[PDB]
Write a protein that binds this ligand. Structure first.
Ligand SMILES: Nc1ncnc2c1ncn2[C@@H]1O[C@H](COP(=O)(O)OP(=O)(O)OP(=O)(O)O)[C@@H](O)[C@H]1O
Ligand SMILES: [Cl-]
Ligand SMILES: [Cl-]
Ligand SMILES: [Cl-]
Ligand SMILES: [Cl-]
Length: 539
């Protein structure tokens, strides 16, 4: 479930040489937000690798920051992983490892390898900048334990003091100039309540949670390539202590962040969109949250395929939204039954037809190896798209117009008799059936086929037409990102659909001919007042 990549090569070489008995990976998101389509890459990579190689993968909540983290985000994270179809071997919480990380810390302090620092942020980084040592650096092992302990009791306030690793303040690598191991927050944790007041930094917690769980390959994105030298440091200096293995050890590997055109994934901006009412909420289908894509109608299978199709590499190349949209169409093609709806309704009267009939109509075209039919009703009163009639039609006009006849899909051929106007625009069409299952006798075929419904049987529907969220490929770095929003991101139209849809399961996903793929919005739709999101348009 992962194409051969630079990683798949390296896992095989390790397993085959018995460096690790099993592959163990993890997906380790912070529970402070909802997952987007980017996180899908890490999900499929890390979980697929497990099943691909009969290994294990931990769903771990890297919950080291009490300010922002909430249990509902961790509920949601698991809902979104399981929804893409992956079965965590284990669901863990880094926070449940805090006692071990703390004890590890004590060991670093004992061994003259950490120290407590009183200087505030600004001065601390201006000294790093100068490669100078904090004056507090060379404190006695004793002094450090005593103050760390006071830190733990909560005697000092938020920010006031940290523990740093003593590596080298003048070090060629800036990340190694005594990085902060522990900070102070007087704030409760959603998982571990009010127990903790010192909390570890990412660069300390991650390797340790890695190590504790016996992760073998730790896969993360290229942002953390610079964080490798500190990761190694934690493991090497703590291996064999506090119940930890002496061997084997986890090793980090970086792959390329996904970057999707006409979309943004930077949490900061996503927050602006939501709180700004640019978007309705986090599961709004305009969003590339996994929440919103589920609601939009995209099948998890489409997302996993997309991720597998784009592959895994160091190719920072931004992916084009065409591509994603095309994998969705592709995914829906063989399983979305085809029906008729109208989105811009224009009424047509037939003067030479009376009564009703019901036409047997196939859900599936010649290409699809699925048979299946439905009763489709016809009457003297219909709606068509306003967009499929014209008084002044262009050269290649394949649709209805004052001379030109047209094929109602799965039914008769019609021609314009009369146009009825009001307010300088077109209000109704009077037309004439010519042809059911047969060409026109006189041989002048209709140049094209249009969809329709009987005004006499059609159900009303609120269609939500979702476009791409931005008109520019690179809103993320383009500068004015809100001035690049697409005003057609959502177009709400009130239309009609053939009544057959009422006898379907509510998660049925349709293609409405000549419009795109659609399904009932799972939140709002009610059978007595249908609401239908467009999943993706046609090509
Ligand atoms: N756009 C992306 N593409 C691929 N992987 C990602 C993307 N964004 C995040 N990840 C991976 O998902 C993991 C967990 O996500 P989390 O929300 O905790 O980090 P964040 O996105 O940097 O904030 C990270 O280790 C990261 O490597
Ligand atoms: Cl090693
Ligand atoms: Cl009648
Ligand atoms: Cl066909
Ligand atoms: Cl037809």
């Amino acid at each position: 479930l992962v194409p051969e990549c630079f990683i798949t090569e390296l896992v095989e070489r390790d397993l085959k040489e018995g460096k690790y008995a099993k592959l163990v990976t993890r997906f380790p998101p912070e529970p402070n937000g909802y997952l987007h389509i980017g996180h899908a890459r890490s999900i499929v990579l890390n979980f697929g690798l497990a099943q691909d190689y009969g290994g294990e993968c931990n769903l771990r909540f890297d919950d080291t920051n009490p300010e922002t983290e909430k249990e509902e985000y961790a509920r949601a994270i698991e809902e979104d992983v399981r929804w893409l179809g992956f079965r965590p071997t284990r669901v863990l919480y880094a926070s449940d490892y805090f006692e071990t990380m703390y004890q590890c810390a004590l060991v670093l302090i004992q061994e003259g390898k950490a120290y407590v620092d009183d200087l505030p942020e600004e001065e601390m980084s201006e000294l790093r900048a100068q490669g100078k040592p904090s004056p507090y650096r060379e404190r006695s092992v004793e002094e450090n334990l005593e103050l760390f302990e006071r830190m733990r009791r909560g005697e000092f306030p938020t920010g006031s003091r940290v523990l740093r690793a003593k590596i080298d303040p003048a070090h060629p690598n800036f990340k190694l100039r005594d990085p902060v191991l522990y900070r102070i927050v007087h704030a409760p944790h959603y998982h571990v309540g009010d127990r903790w007041v010192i909390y570890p930094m990412y660069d300390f917690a991650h390797p340790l949670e890695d190590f504790i769980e016996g992760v073998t390959h730790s896969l993360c994105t290229l942002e953390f390539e610079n964080n490798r030298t500190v990761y190694d440091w934690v493991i090497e200096n703590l291996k064999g202590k506090c119940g930890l293995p002496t061997s084997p050890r986890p090793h980090q590997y970086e792959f390329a962040r996904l970057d999707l055109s006409h979309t943004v994934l930077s949490k900061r901006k996503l927050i602006k969109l939501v709180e700004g009412g640019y978007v309705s909420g986090w599961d709004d289908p305009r969003l590339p949250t996994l929440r919103g894509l589920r609601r939009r109608g995209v099948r998890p299978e489409a997302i996993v395929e997309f991720v597998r199709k784009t592959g895994i590499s160091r190719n920072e190349a931004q992916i084009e939204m065409d591509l994603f949209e095309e994998v969705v169409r592709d995914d829906l093609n063989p399983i979305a039954p085809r029906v008729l709806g109208v989105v811009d309704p224009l009424k047509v009267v037939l003067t030479n037809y009376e009564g009703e009939e019901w036409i047997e109509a196939p859900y599936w075209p010649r290409d699809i190896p699925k048979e299946g039919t439905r009763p489709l009703p016809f009457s003297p009163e219909l709606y068509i798209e306003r967009t499929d009639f014209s008084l002044n039609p262009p050269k290649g006009w394949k649709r209805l117009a004052p001379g030109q006849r047209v094929r109602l899909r799965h039914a008769y051929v019609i021609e314009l008799e009369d146009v009825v106007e009001e307010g300088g625009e077109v209000r109704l069409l009077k037309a004439r059936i010519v042809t059911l299952g047969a060409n026109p006798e006189d041989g002048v075929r209709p140049k094209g086929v249009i969809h329709w419904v009987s005004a006499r049987h059609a159900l009303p529907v609120e269609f939500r037409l979702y476009g791409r969220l931005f008109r520019t490929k690179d809103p993320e770095e383009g500068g004015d990102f809100l001035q690049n929003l697409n005003p057609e991101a959502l177009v709400v139209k009130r239309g009609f659909i053939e009544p057959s849809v009422a006898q379907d399961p509510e998660d049925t996903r349709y293609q409405l001919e000549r419009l795109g793929y659609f399904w009932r919005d799972p939140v709002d739709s009610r059978p007595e007042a249908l609401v239908m999101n467009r999943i993706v348009p046609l090509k």
